[PDB]
Design a protein around this ligand. Sequence first.
Ligand SMILES: N=C(N)c1ccc(OCCCCCCCOc2ccc(C(=N)N)cc2)cc1
Ligand SMILES: N=C(N)c1ccc(OCCCCCCCOc2ccc(C(=N)N)cc2)cc1
Ligand SMILES: [Ca+2]
Ligand SMILES: [Ca+2]
Ligand SMILES: [Ca+2]
Ligand SMILES: [Ca+2]
Lengths: 89, 89
Amino acid sequence: MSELEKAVVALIDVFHQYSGREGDKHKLKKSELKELINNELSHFLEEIKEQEVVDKVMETLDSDGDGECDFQEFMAFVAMITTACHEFF
Amino acid sequence: MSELEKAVVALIDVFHQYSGREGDKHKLKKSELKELINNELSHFLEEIKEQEVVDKVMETLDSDGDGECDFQEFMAFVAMITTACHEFF
Ligand SMILES: N=C(N)c1ccc(OCCCCCCCOc2ccc(C(=N)N)cc2)cc1
Ligand SMILES: N=C(N)c1ccc(OCCCCCCCOc2ccc(C(=N)N)cc2)cc1
Ligand SMILES: [Ca+2]
Ligand SMILES: [Ca+2]
Ligand SMILES: [Ca+2]
Ligand SMILES: [Ca+2]
């Protein structure tokens, strides 16, 4: 498989690594999202230590108002992060 | 770096591998998009052999009507592909 194909699989893997920990196994609740950011985006994003910081990230990500981040919402997060990395080149 | 972080970098790398070949170095024209699909998505997508097949993919991807796929439009493509892989689990 190509690097692109392996990357696609990695996006799916990391979502499930975190989404299945608690509650709805197909969505990231705030606690799971905090863990994902702190453990898997430690070189790109500042560590989240306060509940209000994760509340704000979830508010940005949660487009259907259920308080959790589903797979489509996670795709949008990944697009935001990748665009940020891509910029300040 | 985490698998997620490496995946983010791979998305950026593959875009530039193809976007810089011709014309606007920051966008994929149809010919570049065809090469990317055929060479980097050969396990996920059927090979594109006809101009009309790439025309249709570009039509789907091109949200600002310039006939090319920019980085944001490529992000949307990546989201489509990843969602497809994720489904039929
Ligand atoms: N969140 C921040 N403020 C932050 C700033 C810098 C920083 O640096 C270390 C991370 C290194 C990431 C670079 C990996 C991929 O980078 C690129 C590759 C290609 C291109 C490009 N040609 N546009 C741009 C960036 C990390 C976090
Ligand atoms: N385009 C097609 N029709 C097609 C169908 C099957 C096909 O199979 C070979 C590709 C193997 C891809 C699997 C890699 C990642 O897969 C998943 C991982 C986790 C999950 C999940 N738990 N949702 C789903 C899929 C390729 C192309
Ligand atoms: Ca969950
Ligand atoms: Ca939601
Ligand atoms: Ca180009
Ligand atoms: Ca365009």
